Amino acid sequence: SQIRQNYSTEVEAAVNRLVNLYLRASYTYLSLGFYFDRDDVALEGVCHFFRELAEEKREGAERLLKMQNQRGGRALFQDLQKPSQDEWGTTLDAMKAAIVLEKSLNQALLDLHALGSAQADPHLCDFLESHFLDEEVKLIKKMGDHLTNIQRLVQAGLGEYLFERLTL
Amino acid sequence: SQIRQNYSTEVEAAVNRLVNLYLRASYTYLSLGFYFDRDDVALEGVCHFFRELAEEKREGAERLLKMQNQRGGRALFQDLQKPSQDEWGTTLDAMKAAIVLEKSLNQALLDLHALGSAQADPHLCDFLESHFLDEEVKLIKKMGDHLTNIQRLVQAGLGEYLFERLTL
Amino acid sequence: SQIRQNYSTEVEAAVNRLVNLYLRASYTYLSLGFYFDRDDVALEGVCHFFRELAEEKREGAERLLKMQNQRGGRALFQDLQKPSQDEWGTTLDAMKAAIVLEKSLNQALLDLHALGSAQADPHLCDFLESHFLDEEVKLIKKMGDHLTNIQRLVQAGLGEYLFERLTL
Amino acid sequence: SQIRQNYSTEVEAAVNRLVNLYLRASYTYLSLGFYFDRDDVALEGVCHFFRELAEEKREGAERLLKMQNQRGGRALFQDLQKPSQDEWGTTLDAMKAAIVLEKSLNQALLDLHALGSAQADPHLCDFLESHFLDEEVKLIKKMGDHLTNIQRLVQAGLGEYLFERLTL
Ligand SMILES: CCC[C@H](C)C1(CC)C(=O)NC(=S)NC1=O
Ligand SMILES: CCC[C@H](C)C1(CC)C(=O)NC(=S)NC1=O
């Protein structure tokens, strides 16, 4: 590539993997969103919460793809694995699964940052810090807060309704 | 009729029956609405929900009557049977009865559509699809969502109050 | 399902398959979009054209999922297969592949409509006609128009630049 | 210096060198700009492109000088070497020379960042990342895109005119 400079093949490949992880995360949130839209689940606040997260992860993937091109790397796409569950249980179950997912994304980000540091790639490191690392930390804090409130509310049916109405 | 074209006597009669069904549905919702306005029931959100549905069914009947005339059919009215209950019990009972009513209207619509198809009456078929079929599907989904939330809330008295305050 | 009415297991499954097809189409357009964003391809008008299509297909999938829930069907997700190519060649190659993709989506829509008709499911048939069938016909006409203009322009390099600047 | 803290003599000197590089880059773009303003070259879009870059590099130098003072370093200026060419040939030649220049600036930035990291000077590292590293990456991507389009257009005279009219 005519523009490629200080961009290692290792980082390029790791960025492609992280794109796949973000798209897969988006797909998972899509599934979570429509599960709470089921007539036998019917928690619209929860549905909206997860659908918004699907959009955020998709946007994250697109930002990574833009950066890949800006650096002269080449986007390579793989199959997107279907979400790990077909039915997501209670709001509590769903939020626990969401925090597990975000922590795995966060760890992938931290791994990529470490790689960037080892390759002496400051543009990559700054890119991750500015657009991804703090966003993940804030989202995980929010999920933790939600989990704590859901747990304190669980009269389980009553608690789930009130959380959806008054928080989400 | 000078304007009548491709409008079978079978469809004409079925449309008159569907008008009666919609007016009867409107009357039922009128009764449901005023039951929840009783001082010993006193659930204003529920009262408003059903009164709005009474207006919707009445409007549906008028749209059918307009179409009957547009096609050159002749409106024939029958007695409107009084609603099946004088007292409607809990919000849960009422919502269950409402979904039963809507499914019966929906089935009458599907039957009429089938008749239209067999008579090769595309104007009728399009009319039902554009103004009735999707409206019914959306209303039934909403009722299902309500039923699910009411059920998860039923501290029965507390649940009924919260649903009325926070959803309706 | 408490709300499910006149919704066959066959249609439910076919809708799930069509969701997968739309998500896969969205993924393909995502890949096409970022290919034209490469510094060694650099056709921004083409990139934007395909990225907008990615968004349209994704929205189509979400509308299908909403309808699945409205009817009381159950969304089931499968792996999304990666796009059929990693590199998409010229604008001409890409547009040809795009029209092939849209025709396959269109055929899946026509198959589903035929299924709906055979199952006597007028809500499904109306849903497809109102939101999908005409959109596909219009998009395919537009692509055909583009293909014809690209072809008349192909001084191949010059033609590709002018099309991107003056049409897209 | 009363304010100087954690600012090594090595970084101070490297910053002075980078100021010289940016001023020299500004001077080069000034020359490129006025070459395309010649009546026997006459490509106003190209002239404007390079004149804007002259202003950007000059601003970059001033930001470095401001930072030097903020840290308690002492600005030292050297002769500015005249640009490497008096005449810049075709738009293609000029854009190639521009990308070579930007890559050399980028490498100087990466070297300075590496120095900062080795000296444990996080303020310097953050300063470069926030104001210089991403700007360079974006500018180099843009130049690569331009080069690719110029190349696809080169009927050389015709191609050069169209690029100037329709892109710049
Ligand atoms: C908002 C969900 C997006 C969706 C899950 C998905 C991946 C399947 C995505 O992340 N991005 C695009 S472009 N299309 C898609 O279908
Ligand atoms: C816009 C060009 C600026 C110009 C080349 C130059 C260096 C010669 C510069 O970069 N900055 C200042 S203050 N004066 C100058 O003459």
Curated annotation (Swiss-Prot), chains A, B, C, D:
Q: What Pfam families does its record include? A: Ferritin
Protein name, entry field: Ferritin light chain
What organism is listed for this UniProt entry? Equus caballus
| InterPro entries noted in UniProt | Ferritin, Ferritin-like, Ferritin-like_diiron, Ferritin-like_SF, Ferritin_CS, Ferritin_DPS_dom
Its Gene Ontology cellular component terms are: autolysosome; autophagosome; cytoplasm; cytoplasmic vesicle; ferritin complex
User: Would you identify the family this protein belongs to, as annotated?
Assistant: Belongs to the ferritin family.
Its keywords, alphabetically, are: Acetylation, Cytoplasm, Cytoplasmic vesicle, Iron, Iron storage, Lysosome, Metal-binding
User: Per the annotation, which location comes first and is thus the protein's main one?
Assistant: cytoplasm
What Gene Ontology molecular-function terms does this entry list? ferric iron binding; ferrous iron binding; iron ion binding
* GO aspect biological process, one term: intracellular iron ion homeostasis
Q: Briefly, what is this protein's role?
A: Stores iron in a soluble, non-toxic, readily available form. Important for iron homeostasis. Iron is taken up in the ferrous form and deposited as ferric hydroxides after oxidation. Also plays a role in delivery of iron to cells. Mediates iron uptake in capsule cells of the developing kidney. Delivery to lysosomes by the cargo receptor NCOA4 for autophagic degradation and release or iron.
Domain called Ferritin-like diiron: residue spans: 5-154
Protein localization: Cytoplasmic vesicle, Autophagosome; Cytoplasm; Autolysosome
Q: Quote the SUPFAM superfamilies the UniProt record gives.
A: Ferritin-like (SSF47240)
Per UniProt, subunit arrangement is: Oligomer of 24 subunits. There are two types of subunits: L (light) chain and H (heavy) chain. The major chain can be light or heavy, depending on the species and tissue type. The functional molecule forms a roughly spherical shell with a diameter of 12 nm and contains a central cavity into which the insoluble mineral iron core is deposited. Interacts with NCOA4.
The note filed under miscellaneous reads:
In horse spleen the light chain is the major chain.
Leader sequence range is none
For this protein, the record's Gene3D superfamilies field holds: 1.20.1260.10
Segments carrying the region annotation (Catalytic site for iron oxidation) are 52-59
UniProt cross-references to PANTHER family, sorted A to Z: FERRITIN, FERRITIN LIGHT CHAIN
Q: Which residues bind Fe cation?
A: E52, E55, E56, E59, E62
